[PDB]
Every structure is written in structure tokens, then in C-alpha cells.
Amino acid sequence: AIATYNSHVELAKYLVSKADSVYLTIGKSTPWSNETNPPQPDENATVLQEVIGYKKATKVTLVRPSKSPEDDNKNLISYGNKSWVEVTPENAKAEGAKWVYLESSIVGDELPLGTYRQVGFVMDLVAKSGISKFNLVPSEVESTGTLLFFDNKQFQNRSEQTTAKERFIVEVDPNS
Amino acid sequence: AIATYNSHVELAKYLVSKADSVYLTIGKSTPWSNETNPPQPDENATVLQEVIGYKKATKVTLVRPSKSPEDDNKNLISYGNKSWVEVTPENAKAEGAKWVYLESSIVGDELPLGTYRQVGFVMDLVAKSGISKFNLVPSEVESTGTLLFFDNKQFQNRSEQTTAKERFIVEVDPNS
Amino acid sequence: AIATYNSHVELAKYLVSKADSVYLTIGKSTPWSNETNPPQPDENATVLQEVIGYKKATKVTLVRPSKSPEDDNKNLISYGNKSWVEVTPENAKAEGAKWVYLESSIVGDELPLGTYRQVGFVMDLVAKSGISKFNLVPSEVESTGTLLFFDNKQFQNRSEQTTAKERFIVEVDPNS
Amino acid sequence: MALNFTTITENNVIRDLTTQVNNIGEELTKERNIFDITDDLVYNFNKSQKIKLTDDKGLTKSYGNITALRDIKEPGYYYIGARTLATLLDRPDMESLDVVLHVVPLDTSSKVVQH
Amino acid sequence: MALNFTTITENNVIRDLTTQVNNIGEELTKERNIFDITDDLVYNFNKSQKIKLTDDKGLTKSYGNITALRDIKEPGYYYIGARTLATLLDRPDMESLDVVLHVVPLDTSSKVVQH
Incomplete structure (x- = not known):
């Protein structure tokens, strides 16, 4: 049988509730076949290629696309050629907020400086004892947790001035 | 923008973890337009059409579609024009068990008598204080919780001597 | 003989009064000799190398480094691993604000895509042919005005999704 | 004027792809759509003063570097410090x-009156 | 401004049709899309000098074969031979x-000052 639209809203409320455990991860530090045109991602992958490291999520919330006037007293966002609105977990079913917004930034050199092409977000990441910090290379990690989402992107460099902001808007089922 | 197959496993685990708060519900005491060939169900529902009542789940488990040879030594089920095998929560990613099995049985007039054609399951169902019993009509329920899954069936007739078993097998994304 | 702190403050109020004529510029789309280690910037320069385009300053203001407790309730900005506060022209000598914040974001492809290494800010820039828009390629600049401030970074990449926010904090005498 | 659009994926069913094509087609074909208003603007524009007489603020026009006042021949007003x-x-x-x-312009660009 | 479009054929699957519809929708809904720019042109053209004062090259306006100098009542500059x-x-x-x-224009088109 099918899943309902409100089931997807309850499964997004479960994902947003996990926020403190959520980490960005970056990988694929060597080239694709075409660097302007990466391949589409493999949903059966548990981990990135050529892993560089992990950074905790700076922002986690439900969202939906924004519209006026009814959102003009709420929390707006901008992403991916549209405006969006943060939905608070108690309103989720009323607003229909099946979408999770995920964001982290690698500020400068807090992971090894170089290039990446894969961006993902993991949850239930467990660091080794005595390592509470939010920026991690693969040897500081006791378990990488579950890779919820990832994308194959065009490459990005990192330097001390640059802040490498990476974010996604996603839903547990893109249509059904 | 997509989910991953293992996200669907971690979402099936959550739905099975709730099992004590899970109830069957039954409804549609009046005909379909074709009683041999029921219509597709409506995902936007929050409760059954023509509610008769609610009964506590007798069996909740993960499952997957069965295959020889590797399932030949396991606990098999026959349902929905397919064969299935039971799975435990700690085996879920190993088996790929993104499917939940749910079951309860309504014995005679422990809920009001007649025909029924809808079947559904709800979690987080809370009874009114001083009510401890596992069979509930819609008035003894303080909160119906959330209707997770439901189906439309050919009609079955209930009398004091009849045990109406009802059950499902379902996943969180059957088509992406 | 010497300038004074307050001279620098009043000169910063002068450069802030110019703000509307201020544009980000990006350039050096081909490699350095070492891409990890650029050459140090030459202040006799008048324009960036291999110019990719210009973008109007989305922000220009007086700022200073933040100080506690008296800034703990103010308009904080985060930049280059440091925390800063906005200041207003008529208060600049009371706060000691001799620093100018300069910023512009190149959204996606609103300048031609591909790598850049140089980042600069120009004042007195004048565009061709009555053009209104705030993103300019070199074939739409009439007078480049004056290259005020620039840096020779490592490379970075730009794609349709990624915004390239480039910015500086600067003073008229950083070092006497 | 404004379109209301939602981006479509693989198993958004054909009805959803149809809904967006309908939203696009309706906004581009309603009364006083974008094409009508733009044909109005082209018409009201060609009756206009093609060339500057002031700057954009109603102040004097800028000039290039000039050897003589007889080198400002373009019409309009100019400040000179x-x-x-x-x-x-x-x-x-x-x-x-x-x-x-x-x-002041005349029958020819080569000739002007200067106040 | 420009849409990127490719004409869809029988060789194209329901994915490719979905991609061209997403292309159309995204171009028509971007920040400062076609609709926004045309609403800006309507607003801002309403403070131009909407009526000609020179010709299009910055010379004197033409006239018809008048009987008296008082017949040219429109504002602007006129060479007379x-x-x-x-x-x-x-x-x-x-x-x-x-x-x-x-x-020089006044309160009515029946009056003017003439220099």
C-alpha cells in the first residue's frame, strides 16, 4: 500500500528531532571523468568516496516553499532559486512541512585544506571518547552513523578566508 | 534531492519500535460500487470511513519479500499475493527490511456487529483514565493517535461466532 | 610627522559616503605558478588580472572588532574567524570605528561560471550604455574608477547553485 | 505580474506535470498578460525624448575633457566650475x-547657441 | 533574459518533458524575472521626459508649413529658415x-512663451 503525505511529515519531524547528531561530510578529493558534469549519486552508498571528514550541522529545521501574505510574520529562508519558510515541529502537519533543511559550513582550515566533490549529511555519528568537537577526520570517529543524504557536485577548493557553506532541502519521498 | 534505501530501513525500525501503542481499526460497513473490486484508498484520511472501532495489535514485526535458498530456514508468511519472512530490528539493514507487518484479531461482538470493508492501523492511541481494556469504541479513546496505514477490501460479515483477523505488510516509499 | 586615529576615522566616513560607487571584482581564472601559494598583491596595480566581472557592494558600513560586555546586545557580523559590530557615521569617533566592511555575493551564474583567484573592491566604477544592473562583465564597464582594496587568494570554483559571497574588512592605515 | 510554479520529479504523476504546464500557459495568456503590457511600453516609448538634456537626477550633464566652450555642442545643460x-x-x-x-541645438550639430 | 528550451519529440521520455517544464518554470520565477522587470519599466518610464524636446539626434524639432510663429505651440527647439x-x-x-x-510650456497649450 501507499504511504500518506502526513506520514512523510511525521518522518521529517523524526529527522529534525535528530539535529544534535547530524554532520555534514565531504569527500571525492580527486577528479570525476568530467569536472563540470559529475555523475548522479548512488542511493546504496553508505559513505562518501575518498573521505576528507565530517562537520556537525549548524542548522536543522522543517521547511516549506514561502508565499505572501500568509508567511509575512514567519521565519523566511532563501535556497536553490526560491524563498522557503522554517516550520516549527508543532505546526508541521497543518503547514504540510514534509521538507527538512540541513546546513553546515566548514570555516577555513578546521578540516585539511584542499578540494571536495561529494557533500552529504549523516546522523547518529559517534565520536571517540574525549572528542566532543564538531569538526572530525575519519580516525577521530567511533562510528560514522547513517548517511541520510548526499549529492555529487562540481568541485570546490577550501582556504582560510573562504567559508564552505553546504546545505540541502530534502524530503523522505520526492513525490508519492 | 533523493532519500536512500537505508533511510527507509531506519524509518521502518521506528514504526515497529512503537508496537505497544498500536491498534487495528475497522470500517466501511456500507457497499463499494463494485464489491468484487474495491477502489484505491485515500492517503489524506485521518480515521476510517464508517468507523466501527479499535483493537490492540497482537503482532508487529519487520518483514521482507521471501526468496529461496537464503530464507528456506526462516519463518515464512503468505499475504497480499506474495510470500514474506519475519525480521528483527537489529537485523534490519542486513536483510534490507524496510517493510513492517502489523496484525490484530476482533473476536465476535467485542466491537459492534455487521459487515466491514476497511482496515487500518494507528499508533499513539491513548484510552481515557480508568479504561485499561484492549478493545475500544470511538468514545472510550482520549486520543486516536495517528492513522499510519489503511486499505480497502472485499466485504467480510461479523457475527458473535466469527474472529475477524486483519493484517498488513507496508514500506515507507514503495515506488522511488 | 604623523596622522592620527581620528583622521583615519573621518577618512573611513569619507569612503563609506562613496559606497554606491563600490563594486566587488573577481579575476585570475587561469592558474598561478603555485595554486596553494599565490604571489603577494602589488598595490601599484590598477585592475585585477583576467577579469571575470564586477558586482555592486551589497553592503558597505563602518565596523569595529566586537568587545564584551558592551557589544553583547548589538548588530554582530562574523568574518574570517572573527566577530565584528556595525557602526554609524555620526558615532564613528565615539566607538573608534575606523574599519570599513565591504561585501558582495555573486549568486550562481550571474557572472560567467568557472574558477577565480583574485578578489578586489573598486570605487567610482561607471558602467556603459545607461545599464542599471549590479553584475557587470568587462565589456559593460566604461570607467573602472579606482581599485581600492584587493587580495590574491587560492582558486575557488562557482556553479549554478553556489553563491560566491566575497568580502573584506579594511582601514585607511592598517599598520603605522 | 507573477507565475506560481512548483518543480517536478520522476514520479510526480502526469497530472502534476500537466498542472504546472497549465499554470505557465494561464499566466502567459490571461487578460493584460506580459506580452500586451510590453507592446504598450514599446508604443509609448518611441514618442520620447531619445537623448539626455540633464543627468538622471535632473542636474547638469557631464562633459568630456574640453579645450574650449565651443567643444560642448551636445544639447542640454552643463555645470562648469x-x-x-x-x-x-x-x-x-x-x-x-x-x-x-x-x-541650444540648431538645424545642424556643427552649429549651436550657447547661453 | 533568456529561456533555455529544446523542442520535445517521440524519442523523448516523460523525464525530458519534465526537464523542459522545470526549465520554463525556473526562468519565469527567478529573482527579477521578466514580470518584475516589465513592472519596473512601467513604473520608471513615468518620470522620463515622455514628450520630445529635440529630434532623436539632438538637433531642433521639425515643424509643418505654419502661417505664423505663434502656430508652433509644442515645447522644445525649432530652427526656422x-x-x-x-x-x-x-x-x-x-x-x-x-x-x-x-x-517654453505654460498652464495651457493655447499659451506659450516664445524666444
């Missing part, structure tokens, strides 16, 4: 002061 | 030379 006026080969015989020059 | 002026009913008592008329 005393320090510039004291460097032009055909300045009037008068004390150096700030001025405004009004250049 | 000596031969023309010599036959006007209201011409000043002076040598017929080529002249310019500047017309």
Missing part, C-alpha cells in the same frame, strides 16, 4: 566664477 | 536671417 573655466581657450572676458552653460 | 520667416504673418521687423525658436 571656476577652476575649469579658467582653462578654456574661448572663455568670456570676465572674472573666474562657477557657471552653467546651456547649449 | 530665413525664407520661411520672411513669409510668416507675425515675424519681427528685422532682416530675415535663419533663426531658432525656443518654445
Whole structure:
């Protein structure tokens, strides 16, 4: 049988509730076949290629696309050629907020400086004892947790001035 | 923008973890337009059409579609024009068990008598204080919780001597 | 003989009064000799190398480094691993604000895509042919005005999704 | 004017793809759509004063570097500060002061009246 | 501004049709899309000098074959040739030379100041 639209809203409320455990991860530090045109991602992958490291999520919330006037007293966002609105977990079913917004930034050199092409977000990441910090290379990690989402992107460099902001808007089922 | 197959496993685990708060519900005491060939169900529902009542789940488990040879030594089920095998929560990613099995049985007039054609399951169902019993009509329920899954069936007739078993097998994304 | 702190403050109020004529510029789309280690910037320069385009300053203001407790309730900005506060022209000598914040974001492809290494800010820039828009390629600049401030970074990449926010904090005498 | 659009994926069913194509088609074909308003603007535009007489703020036009006041031939109004006026080969015989020059067009660009 | 479009054929699957619909929708809904820019043109063209004061090259406006200088009541600049002026009913008592008329607008189109 099918899943309902409100089931997807309850499964997004479960994902947003996990926020403190959520980490960005970056990988694929060597080239694709075409660097302007990466391949589409493999949903059966548990981990990135050529892993560089992990950074905790700076922002986690439900969202939906924004519209006026009814959102003009709420929390707006901008992403991916549209405006969006943060939905608070108690309103989720009323607003229909099946979408999770995920964001982290690698500020400068807090992971090894170089290039990446894969961006993902993991949850239930467990660091080794005595390592509470939010920026991690693969040897500081006791378990990488579950890779919820990832994308194959065009490459990005990192330097001390640059802040490498990476974010996604996603839903547990893109249509059904 | 997509989910991953293992996200669907971690979402099936959550739905099975709730099992004590899970109830069957039954409804549609009046005909379909074709009683041999029921219509597709409506995902936007929050409760059954023509509610008769609610009964506590007798069996909740993960499952997957069965295959020889590797399932030949396991606990098999026959349902929905397919064969299935039971799975435990700690085996879920190993088996790929993104499917939940749910079951309860309504014995005679422990809920009001007649025909029924809808079947559904709800979690987080809370009874009114001083009510401890596992069979509930819609008035003894303080909160119906959330209707997770439901189906439309050919009609079955209930009398004091009849045990109406009802059950499902379902996943969180059957088509992406 | 010497300038004074307050001279620098009043000169910063002068450069802030110019703000509307201020544009980000990006350039050096081909490699350095070492891409990890650029050459140090030459202040006799008048324009960036291999110019990719210009973008109007989305922000220009007086700022200073933040100080506690008296800034703990103010308009904080985060930049280059440091925390800063906005200041207003008529208060600049009371706060000691001799620093100018300069910023512009190149959204996606609103300048031609591909790598850049140089980042600069120009004042007195004048565009061709009555053009209104705030993103300019070199074939739409009439007078480049004056290259005020620039840096020779490592490379970075730009794609349709990624915004390239480039910015500086600067003073008229950083070092006497 | 504004379209209301939602981006579509693989198993958004054909009805959803149809809904967006309908939203697009309706906004581009309603009464006083974007095409009608733009044909109105082209029409009201060609009756306009093609060329500057002031700057964009209603102040005097800028000029290039000039050897003489007889080198400003374009029509409109121009400010000239005393320090510039004291460097032009055909300045009037008068004390150096700030001025405004009004250049009046004629039958030919080569000829003008200057106030 | 520009849409990227490719005409869809029988070789194209429901994915490719979905991609061209997403292309159309995204271009028509981007920040400062076609609709926004045309609403800005309607708002801002309403403070231009909507009526010509020169010709399109920055010379004097043309006129029709008038009877008297008082017949040119529209504002702007008008070269008049000596031969023309010599036959006007209201011409000043002076040598017929080529002249310019500047017309200055007032409260009504039946009145003007003429220089």
C-alpha cells in the first residue's frame, strides 16, 4: 500500500528531532571523468568516496516553499532559486512541512585544506571518547552513523578566508 | 534531492519500535460500487470511513519479500499475493527490511456487529483514565493517535461466532 | 610627522559616503605558478588580472572588532574567524570605528561560471550604455574608477547553485 | 505580474506535470498578460525624448575633457566650475566664477547657441 | 533574459518533458524575472521626459508649413529658415536671417512663451 503525505511529515519531524547528531561530510578529493558534469549519486552508498571528514550541522529545521501574505510574520529562508519558510515541529502537519533543511559550513582550515566533490549529511555519528568537537577526520570517529543524504557536485577548493557553506532541502519521498 | 534505501530501513525500525501503542481499526460497513473490486484508498484520511472501532495489535514485526535458498530456514508468511519472512530490528539493514507487518484479531461482538470493508492501523492511541481494556469504541479513546496505514477490501460479515483477523505488510516509499 | 586615529576615522566616513560607487571584482581564472601559494598583491596595480566581472557592494558600513560586555546586545557580523559590530557615521569617533566592511555575493551564474583567484573592491566604477544592473562583465564597464582594496587568494570554483559571497574588512592605515 | 510554479520529479504523476504546464500557459495568456503590457511600453516609448538634456537626477550633464566652450555642442545643460573655466581657450572676458552653460541645438550639430 | 528550451519529440521520455517544464518554470520565477522587470519599466518610464524636446539626434524639432510663429505651440527647439520667416504673418521687423525658436510650456497649450 501507499504511504500518506502526513506520514512523510511525521518522518521529517523524526529527522529534525535528530539535529544534535547530524554532520555534514565531504569527500571525492580527486577528479570525476568530467569536472563540470559529475555523475548522479548512488542511493546504496553508505559513505562518501575518498573521505576528507565530517562537520556537525549548524542548522536543522522543517521547511516549506514561502508565499505572501500568509508567511509575512514567519521565519523566511532563501535556497536553490526560491524563498522557503522554517516550520516549527508543532505546526508541521497543518503547514504540510514534509521538507527538512540541513546546513553546515566548514570555516577555513578546521578540516585539511584542499578540494571536495561529494557533500552529504549523516546522523547518529559517534565520536571517540574525549572528542566532543564538531569538526572530525575519519580516525577521530567511533562510528560514522547513517548517511541520510548526499549529492555529487562540481568541485570546490577550501582556504582560510573562504567559508564552505553546504546545505540541502530534502524530503523522505520526492513525490508519492 | 533523493532519500536512500537505508533511510527507509531506519524509518521502518521506528514504526515497529512503537508496537505497544498500536491498534487495528475497522470500517466501511456500507457497499463499494463494485464489491468484487474495491477502489484505491485515500492517503489524506485521518480515521476510517464508517468507523466501527479499535483493537490492540497482537503482532508487529519487520518483514521482507521471501526468496529461496537464503530464507528456506526462516519463518515464512503468505499475504497480499506474495510470500514474506519475519525480521528483527537489529537485523534490519542486513536483510534490507524496510517493510513492517502489523496484525490484530476482533473476536465476535467485542466491537459492534455487521459487515466491514476497511482496515487500518494507528499508533499513539491513548484510552481515557480508568479504561485499561484492549478493545475500544470511538468514545472510550482520549486520543486516536495517528492513522499510519489503511486499505480497502472485499466485504467480510461479523457475527458473535466469527474472529475477524486483519493484517498488513507496508514500506515507507514503495515506488522511488 | 604623523596622522592620527581620528583622521583615519573621518577618512573611513569619507569612503563609506562613496559606497554606491563600490563594486566587488573577481579575476585570475587561469592558474598561478603555485595554486596553494599565490604571489603577494602589488598595490601599484590598477585592475585585477583576467577579469571575470564586477558586482555592486551589497553592503558597505563602518565596523569595529566586537568587545564584551558592551557589544553583547548589538548588530554582530562574523568574518574570517572573527566577530565584528556595525557602526554609524555620526558615532564613528565615539566607538573608534575606523574599519570599513565591504561585501558582495555573486549568486550562481550571474557572472560567467568557472574558477577565480583574485578578489578586489573598486570605487567610482561607471558602467556603459545607461545599464542599471549590479553584475557587470568587462565589456559593460566604461570607467573602472579606482581599485581600492584587493587580495590574491587560492582558486575557488562557482556553479549554478553556489553563491560566491566575497568580502573584506579594511582601514585607511592598517599598520603605522 | 507573477507565475506560481512548483518543480517536478520522476514520479510526480502526469497530472502534476500537466498542472504546472497549465499554470505557465494561464499566466502567459490571461487578460493584460506580459506580452500586451510590453507592446504598450514599446508604443509609448518611441514618442520620447531619445537623448539626455540633464543627468538622471535632473542636474547638469557631464562633459568630456574640453579645450574650449565651443567643444560642448551636445544639447542640454552643463555645470562648469571656476577652476575649469579658467582653462578654456574661448572663455568670456570676465572674472573666474562657477557657471552653467546651456547649449541650444540648431538645424545642424556643427552649429549651436550657447547661453 | 533568456529561456533555455529544446523542442520535445517521440524519442523523448516523460523525464525530458519534465526537464523542459522545470526549465520554463525556473526562468519565469527567478529573482527579477521578466514580470518584475516589465513592472519596473512601467513604473520608471513615468518620470522620463515622455514628450520630445529635440529630434532623436539632438538637433531642433521639425515643424509643418505654419502661417505664423505663434502656430508652433509644442515645447522644445525649432530652427526656422530665413525664407520661411520672411513669409510668416507675425515675424519681427528685422532682416530675415535663419533663426531658432525656443518654445517654453505654460498652464495651457493655447499659451506659450516664445524666444
